């Protein structure tokens, strides 16, 4: 009991936490590994994601060597604040939380040879820039970059504890994604240069693919059916002027309702996405189906249609006959071009 | 070797008084500032502010922190900043700001042998930006960031951009959702008052709003509806059911476009360029339906007591006037 107490008090006599280990003598090498407990939700509107990790850092400090019956020393969180630790920060972090419920979720362990292990539980909210030009058929590689804030490449270097592929471990139930599919992650390290010097940056990229099934049922299928519905009016007799007029205008109103709702499910960006062009083309087709009838009606000589018992009657418009072929063909050709363009990337 | 560094730091901090600026009784201490911008996000028209994250560096010379015999720059623990003097620099138009503290407080203190001190901060600040949205969405914005000293005049402290025009980096790497940074400027000036001049630095941007989404979702559908209302002019005047249903449904469609864009677009309670065009298209479809009522009254009301002239006249004037309305509109706002 008293032996354990003596070593703790003896450790910090003469220690200076303001100086990194091996200052002016060598480079402080830090070995890091990350265990992701949950890859939280990805916010398209904010272009950011949340991640819950157990962050580990290991390094050697000769100033903390001790000899005693125990081989590993467990430090109180108060004592862990009196010892130099790496000032690791996330370059793309936006607002991270270091949990301290019900106690600070930190743990500092010292071995007899002066090797320190520093594990902390963190919730990191990091920005993931996205190119939404192929929405909703887009894929992203959300990064997670961290490194030293104040110590250059010549003072502190970071390394992965194991092979980089195996250093970042994601839990089997880690994924908490509703709209994306976590395909995997790539782990690498690099060098960045700033106005304050060269720094070592450890990067992890999480590769996400958006689920398309929701947009097919909510947006793509109703738009296709509405365009088919507008082209259905070509099979009505030309003498049903009120019927084809109401048919034409109400399909335009139906498309307008669908277009507005489909945009509300997309984050507020001012450039054109892939779904915007599909709706715009569908809008043009429904618009043209009503202009086509205006041309057909302009040549309808008689206001009475054919009767079952049988006088001369109006013939089937040659404009209507061609429209029954051109409009379904042109829309079908557009669909093949549209899907082959985006599903082959 | 390391033990020598420990005593040097103790000597520098022995007798150091953080209540006195460098060269307290002499010339003002020149503070050089440069900013590394990480990202700009949440450019809010409703709140008239933007949020940016930046690396904020400050340079000044403190002869009290000059050391000899060590050919290295002493990067110390970030907690040593509380034991030194730092400028009282604040952002004048800042509404809400904080310093990131994961995994530790993101600040640095680097000492140089001649006494130069580098004090860097990673700050996320929401800065106010008063926006003139009368030309929305065909508008440009100018959002600034004012840097001032709270309690020191130009006799005590001075500001300048270290590196000149290269002081601020990372501007060209920013990608805003609905904007596009055209240019940025650095301004150094003194705020002259009766008491004295106060140093101030100003970093400003010029934001140009992208128009692609508005063309596809606001202007083009409104143009198509207006053109559809002209179809009534090519239907026989006696087709009351066909012409009225076409006329009144385009009015309903325009109302649907206007009301739904009101909810989707940011709440900006004054007349903008987008509202004038939507209102203009609403009037045109209103007049197309009103045109038929005049035609129908002439033939049936005043009839017993030619109606193809009013339709022939409308088949030209309506396409001509709407194109003229577009010509005046797009020349005014562009």
């Amino acid at each position, epitope marked *: 009991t008293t032996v354990f107490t003596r070593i703790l008090d003896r450790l910090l006599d003469g220690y200076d936490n303001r100086l990194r280990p091996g200052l002016g003598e060598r480079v402080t090498e830090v070995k890091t590994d990350i265990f992701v407990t949950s890859f939280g939700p990805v916010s398209d509107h904010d272009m950011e994601y949340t991640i819950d990790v157990f962050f580990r850092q290991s390094w050697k400090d000769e100033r903390l060597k001790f000899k005693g019956p125990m081989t590993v020393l467990r430090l109180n969180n108060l004592m862990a604040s009196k010892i130099w630790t790496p000032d690791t920060f996330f370059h793309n972090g936006k607002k991270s939380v270091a949990h301290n419920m019900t106690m600070p979720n930190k743990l500092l362990r010292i071995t007899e040879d002066g090797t320190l292990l520093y594990t902390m539980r963190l919730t990191v909210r990091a920005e993931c820039p996205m*190119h939404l030009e192929d929405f909703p058929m887009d894929a*992203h*590689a959300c990064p997670l*970059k961290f490194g030293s804030y104040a110590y250059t490449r010549a003072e502190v270097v970071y390394e992965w504890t194991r092979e980089p592929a195996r250093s970042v471990v994601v839990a089997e139930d880690g994924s908490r994604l509703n709209q994306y599919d976590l*395909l*995997g992650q790539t782990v*690498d390290s690099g060098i960045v240069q700033s106005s304050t010097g060269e720094y070592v940056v450890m990067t992890t990229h999480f*590769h996400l693919k958006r689920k398309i099934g929701y947009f097919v049922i909510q947006t793509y299928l109703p738009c296709i059916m509405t365009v088919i519905l507008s082209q259905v009016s070509f099979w009505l007799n030309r003498e049903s002027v009120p019927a084809r007029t109401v048919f034409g205008v109400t399909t335009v109103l139906t498309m307008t309702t669908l277009s507005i709702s489909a945009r509300n499910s997309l984050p507020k960006v001012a450039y054109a996405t892939a779904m915007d062009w599909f709706i715009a083309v569908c809008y043009a087709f429904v618009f043209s189906a009503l202009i086509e009838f205006a041309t057909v009606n302009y040549f309808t000589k008689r206001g009475y249609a054919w009767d079952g018992k049988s006088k001369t009657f109006n013939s089937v418009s040659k404009i209507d006959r061609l429209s029954r072929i051109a409009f379904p063909l042109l829309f079908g050709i557009f669909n093949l071009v549209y899907w082959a363009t985006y599903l082959n990337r | 070797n390391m033990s020598f560094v420990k005593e040097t730091v103790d000597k520098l901090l022995k007798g150091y008084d953080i209540r006195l600026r460098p060269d307290f009784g002499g010339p003002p201490v020149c503070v050089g500032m440069n900013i590394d911008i990480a990202s700009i996000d949440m450019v809010s028209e409703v709140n008239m502010d933007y949020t940016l994250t930046m690396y904020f560096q400050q340079y000044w010379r403190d002869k009290r922190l000059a050391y000899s015999g060590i050919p290295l720059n002493l990067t110390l623990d970030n907690r040593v900043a509380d034991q030194l003097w730092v400028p009282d620099t604040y952002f004048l138009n800042d509404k809400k700001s904080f310093v990131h503290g994961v995994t530790v407080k993101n600040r640095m203190i680097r000492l140089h042998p001649d006494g130069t001190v580098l004090y860097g901060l990673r700050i996320t600040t929401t800065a106010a930006c008063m926006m003139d949205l009368r030309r929305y969405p065909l508008d440009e914005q100018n959002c600034t960031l004012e840097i001032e000293s709270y309690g020191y005049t130009t006799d005590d402290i001075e500001f300048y951009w270290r590196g000149g025009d290269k002081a601020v980096t990372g501007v060209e790497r920013i990608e805003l959702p609905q904007f596009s940074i055209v240019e940025h400027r650095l301004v150094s000036r003194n705020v002259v008052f009766a008491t004295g001049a106060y140093p101030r630095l100003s970093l400003s941007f010029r934001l140009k709003r992208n128009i692609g989404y508005f063309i596809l979702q606001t202007y083009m559908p409104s143009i198509l509806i207006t053109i559809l209302s002209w179809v009534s002019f090519w239907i026989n005047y006696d087709a009351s059911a066909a012409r009225v249903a076409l006329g009144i449904t385009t009015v309903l469609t325009m109302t649907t476009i206007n009301t739904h864009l009101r909810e989707t677009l940011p709440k900006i309670p004054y007349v903008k360029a987008i509202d004038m065009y939507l209102m203009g298209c609403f009037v045109f479809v209103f007049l197309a339906l009103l045109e038929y009522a005049f035609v129908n009254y002439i033939f049936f009301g005043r009839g017993p007591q030619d109606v193809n002239a009013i339709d022939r006249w409308s088949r030209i004037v309506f396409p001509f006037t709407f194109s003229l309305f577009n010509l005046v509109y797009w020349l005014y706002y562009v």
Partner: nanobody
Amino acid sequence: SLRVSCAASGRTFTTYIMAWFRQAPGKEREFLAAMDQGRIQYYGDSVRGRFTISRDYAKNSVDLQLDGLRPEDTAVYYCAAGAGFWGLRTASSYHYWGQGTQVTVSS
């Protein structure tokens, strides 16, 4: 000392990863260097510390600084740009490719 540039036209690559690749005759396509939006620089083992990659975000271009050239480096150099999906070192992750440049080293 040899410096190789790569001009990009028709699209701004501010938020794209611009990389350089080398293809030895008949062997394979080898990753050399890359730089993402955040200016993070990545290098291969065989060219770590030897080659320098720099991106001109204003001019939308990426430059490669070759120093200490060896006869092993005599190959075709390509300029690539992509989103780095499924690793920024794999050649299959890059879509926009330059026409290539031939570098011949004689000693």
